[PDB]
């Protein structure tokens, strides 16, 4: 037959970089270095990257290029008994689309909010403020910074929600920003990679320009070198601790995207004899290199705050959305030409998420187009049907309690659910399908087989690597809370529906296909353990 292919090699490389490089490279990696002995954290981060992360990254990329199909068909064409893996992964990515784009909407709201010479989040004398407002971050819960109250009491209006039961009014300024996000995602994804592979040129490259600028602005700041000290001063007392190796393992596995069917779908439009092994190493490196660079951008500024603004580094060295929507903007408002750093900062955050949202959506579309040609012949219709569902339900995230809705999905939509999914991917490839066939498949593509190193990592390391994460992920479990709020019992179990909603397709479709193929049980396993190419 004939399947569409990238109009250029860079279009693919940028689509994969744009997917892999997002906010977690900015608001989590530097925190982990800071939290876990500085430069010493690079040791377990690098080991977990070379034995768990990149082996899984390389697998899906190779596996997607070789089978020329999306996530559902590929795993059906590989281990038919485990076609449910594809099903599981497709709607994990479907769930994530309900909260991830909320971050891009916030980034655009702060962008539109920065069109002035007096950035609003710098003062404590506005209508949205409390008597307990501080000019900069402290370490007492009831006394919040001027930037934290702007984000919480004006942008979010989160003070008006008693919990997830009380979502309250829809913020149509937010609802509008969210629509602009899905509009961009539409006119970039409706015509396929012909146009998608070109938008990533901007969304994946623009952040590097901003990083470059902010890197120079940060290092030229007084106190910049003090932040770099807090960032990278090594302390190997941590390497002996297990919770560090978990942070490294978990960040590695999540900063890269393996198993989400995104890389699968992306590599599926590669040429069969493309050197995907060269592509995996290059793209992996750039993802980690970007986090390492972004660390300087953040901590040069974080030191300037602790040096010239009189704050304790522990109070501003934070992670998650608080770092990009509260902490870093506060420092900008002190700098001259403040208005300039804001606009590029929030555009960087937007472009950092957009190209990741692209891959998640494309993983869904591609997977479904390769299984239901009715929607393959009607792409522009399917995406509008998809994105409108995303927008309508997305209005809940634009309510006054939308964060409680956001935090709920961020915990359950893809946390354990993807770990178990990739666990079977690794088992299906290395054990059911076979490293022999897999290596033989790769040789035919790139001309040489994988080294014994990669084969050992796919067969033993990656499973325990994922197991290592899933075990300790369950040990440190505690019910869902945000600030002084404790989610009700029913909301907790709701996230378990969402988690198991995907994973259940793995044993379900196994059962449904075991009961649909005729023969004896070993006669049925053998019919469901032989690939389509055979």
């Amino acid at each position, epitope marked *: 037959d004939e399947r569409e292919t990238w109009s250029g090699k860079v279009d693919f490389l940028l689509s994969v970089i744009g997917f892999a490089v997002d906010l977690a490279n900015v608001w989590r990696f530097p925190y982990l270095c800071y939290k876990n002995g500085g430069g010493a954290f690079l040791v377990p981060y690098g080991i977990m990257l070379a034995v768990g992360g990149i082996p899984l990254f390389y697998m899906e990329l190779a596996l997607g290029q070789h089978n020329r199909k999306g996530a559902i068909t590929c795993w059906g064409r590989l281990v038919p008994l485990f076609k449910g893996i594809g099903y599981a992964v497709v709607l994990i990515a479907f769930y994530v689309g309900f909260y991830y784009n909320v971050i891009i909407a916030w980034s655009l709201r702060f962008f539109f909010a920065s069109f002035t010479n007096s950035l609003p989040w710098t003062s404590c004398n506005n209508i949205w403020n409390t008597p307990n407002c501080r000019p900069f971050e402290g370490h007492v819960e009831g006394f919040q910074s001027a930037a934290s109250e702007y984000f919480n009491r004006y942008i979010l209006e989160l003070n008006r929600s008693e919990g997830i039961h009380d979502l309250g009014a829809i913020k149509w300024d937010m609802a509008l920003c969210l629509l602009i996000v899905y509009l961009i995602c539409y006119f970039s994804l409706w015509k396929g990679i012909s146009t998608s592979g070109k938008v990533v040129w901007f969304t994946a490259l623009f952040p590097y320009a901003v990083l470059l600028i902010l890197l120079i602005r940060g290092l030229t700041l007084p106190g910049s070198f003090l932040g770099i000290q807090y960032y990278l001063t090594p302390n190997f007392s941590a390497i002996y601790k297990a919770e560090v190796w978990v942070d490294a393992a978990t960040q590695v596995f999540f900063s890269l995207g393996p198993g989400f069917g995104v890389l699968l779908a992306y590599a599926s439009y590669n040429k069969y004899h493309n050197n995907v092994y060269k592509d995996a190493l290059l793209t992996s490196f750039i993802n980690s290199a970007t986090s390492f660079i972004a660390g300087f951008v953040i901590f040069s500024v974080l030191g300037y705050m602790a040096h010239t603004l009189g704050v304790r580094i522990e109070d501003v060295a934070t992670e998650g959305p608080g770092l990009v929507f509260v902490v870093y903007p506060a420092a900008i408002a002190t700098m001259p030409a403040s208005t300039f750093w804001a606009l590029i900062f929030f555009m960087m955050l937007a472009t950092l998420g957009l190209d990741s949202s692209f891959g998640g959506m494309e993983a869904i579309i591609t997977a479904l187009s390769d299984e239901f040609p009715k929607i393959k012949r009607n792409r522009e219709l399917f995406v509008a049907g998809l994105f409108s569902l995303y927008f309508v339900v997305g209005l809940a995230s634009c309510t006054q309690g939308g964060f409680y809705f956001f935090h709920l999905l961020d915990r359950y939509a893809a946390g354990y659910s993807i770990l178990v999914a990739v666990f079977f991917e690794a088992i299906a490839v290395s054990w059911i399908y076979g490293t022999n066939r897999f290596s033989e498949d790769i*040789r*035919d593509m790139i*001309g040489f*087989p994988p080294g014994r190193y990669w084969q050992v990592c796919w067969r033993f390391v990656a499973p325990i690597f994922l197991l290592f994460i899933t075990v300790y992920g369950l040990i440190g479990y505690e019910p869902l809370t945000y600030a002084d709020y404790v989610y009700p019992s029913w909301a907790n179990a709701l996230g378990w529906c969402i988690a198991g909603s995907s994973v259940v397709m793995i044993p379900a479709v196994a059962i449904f296909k075991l009961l649909s193929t005729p023969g004896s049980l070993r006669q049925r396993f053998t019919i469901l353990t032989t690939p389509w*190419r055979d």
Partner: antibody
Amino acid sequence: EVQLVESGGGLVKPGGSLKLSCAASGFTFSSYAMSWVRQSPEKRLEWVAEISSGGRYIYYSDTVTGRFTISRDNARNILHLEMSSLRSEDTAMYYCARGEVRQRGFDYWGQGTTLTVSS
Amino acid sequence: ENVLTQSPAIMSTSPGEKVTMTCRASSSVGSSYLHWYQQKSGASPKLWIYSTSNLASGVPARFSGSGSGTSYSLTISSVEAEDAATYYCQQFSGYPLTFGSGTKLEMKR
């Protein structure tokens, strides 16, 4: 170390069939893609067929396709070439070569077995 | 198919001199897919140079490889009589795989 021994082959009549065999020893035969290369009596090297490690990827030259069948016995470590509709231009010495890495060529060759196709 | 032509066809050299042989392809070949074989009279071929310039195991350093695209060359710095043989190039970047037409190196006396 690695050793390859081609066997079978001698004189056939035009149209006849014949089956050549290569006995591998000294390495994990099932881990390496093998190929049949031949050399006409005018001393010209011509690649004939390649078979992948597991025998799932097969390539024929356009001069022998439909007539030659390459196969693999990873249990006994034997390589096979089944010939049918034999023509005189198929007269050559047939070499069994080991070449798993394309970026490395054929690093090991047998000693050849001779095939003469004449009436 | 990608025709590989070698010149010269026959070549006579006095021991110690410097020989150069060329291999010209009808279609560009990746520098990493071009190899060379040495075949002695009445014996089997042996892999000599792989990936344009890398010497195989047991190959003395007087041999070098060079080239790109459609033009490659094998060079022997100072020839020895144990180098008298026919040298074949090969491409492995396209099926059908193809061998060059050969260069026979003979000893001058």
